[PDB]
Amino acid sequence: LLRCRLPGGVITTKQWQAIDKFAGENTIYGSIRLTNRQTFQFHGILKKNVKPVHQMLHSVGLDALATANDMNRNVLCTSNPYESQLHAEAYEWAKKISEHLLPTYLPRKFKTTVVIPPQNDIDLHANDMNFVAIAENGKLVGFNLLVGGGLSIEHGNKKTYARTASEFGYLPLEHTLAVAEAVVTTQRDWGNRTDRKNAKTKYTLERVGVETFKAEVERRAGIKFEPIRPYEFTGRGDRIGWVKGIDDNWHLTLFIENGRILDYPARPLKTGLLEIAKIHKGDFRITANQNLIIAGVPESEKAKIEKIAKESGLMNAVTPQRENSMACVSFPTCPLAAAEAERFLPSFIDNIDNLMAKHGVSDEHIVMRVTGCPNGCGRAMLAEVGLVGKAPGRYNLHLGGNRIGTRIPRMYKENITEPEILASLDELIGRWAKEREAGEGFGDFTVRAGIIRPVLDPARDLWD
């Protein structure tokens, strides 16, 4: 298992050129796969090239997590905040937390984020430990801490469940690392190590109680949490296209379907990104939606960068629906896959695009995700519409998440095929188009209309 460490998804153009060369010359599939934890993966490396890939990463200042004994995963950080001036400091803290957690053997892997409201692009409720940034005058002052998210479930096993993260309270910036260590060590000590399926923090919190865990974290960190400071999310999507950053700098976010970077007929995505890497003056940022930001372009350079991106297929227009859909890797490389996900999504969303046009909502979107098995890597269990692989060509259909990702969708239909999913969504999208209130999301609508019951307390009411 290769898990390249890249806190906050920030990667230099020198680093990009090295991984581009390795992917093209030293792997079966020839691709760079952006992951939804803001890093990248190679597929099909070979025995003769495993030692070369660690040397390659080292040659450009990169390292892979020692997954055999390191239970941490990549630390996420909001990639393209609306208050652009906050990114540098938030990214600095994501790096500090990432380095602080480098090798205490944990009972189960442990996932952390740094979030900048109003964007929940990093999907905080899928993670064990979340630091929600609070700022004054463009300067970070502290974090709200939320603990205990996690999406993995086992089909037919009602002792497993997806869970959102719970608010603990606010901490001043100076206590960040002490709090992070206290959460990790409390989970290390209290987690159910013997039963790996019960070992995640989400289960520990439900076993001992949120207040009990929170009080122990306060004891170990030497602090008392303050009341939560106000925050609200408005969405989870990337900002596709150009946005203005700090100074005279501009950020170009490129939609990349499934994060799969390869040269395709008439769409040389991989060569195009290499060409951009050779001239770009800043860094790249891999997003948690498997897209790529060409970050910090001076205004005078926009035309040159855009020319390469448009000619290479990296700026081919897609619907808002496609921009807000995601799938995991699944087949052909995942050994755990039950149903296709990545290879299913492009034609599935072609069909969804037709339904959206049919019902006159082609400018709208539904956060729609496909995960190839119930491990949940595609984050379908935070979607408005989630598909969870069951068997070849068959999925459980979940409805009733929301746009901002703070609610688990309940299972609506079990073990059905794509034609059955599309027939159901045709009916439901049509109802939503006609009956929605102003600005009302599809997931909120399915709950309000009584199409599906909401999940209010997943440890006790996720399963029917």
Ligand code: SRM
């Ligand atoms: C690449 C990625 C999906 C993607 O399309 O982007 C992915 C791919 C895989 N994940 Fe993951 N997971 C990815 C995000 C996730 C997430 C979502 C997230 O973290 O934001 C989850 C659900 C959140 C959570 O953990 O609760 C996730 C939960 C899992 C699990 C179930 C963990 C559990 O608690 O039970 C496994 C299976 C396991 O660990 O035993 C797993 C295992 C795997 C493996 C390594 C399969 C394996 O064990 O052999 C996958 C390799 C597929 C392949 O061929 O490349 N992956 N995986 C993501 C890589 C992120 C990264 O850079 O580290």
Ligand code: SF4
């Ligand atoms: S969800 Fe299942 S199929 Fe998809 S990548 Fe994760 S483990 Fe593989």
Ligand SMILES: [K+]
């Ligand atoms: K994408």
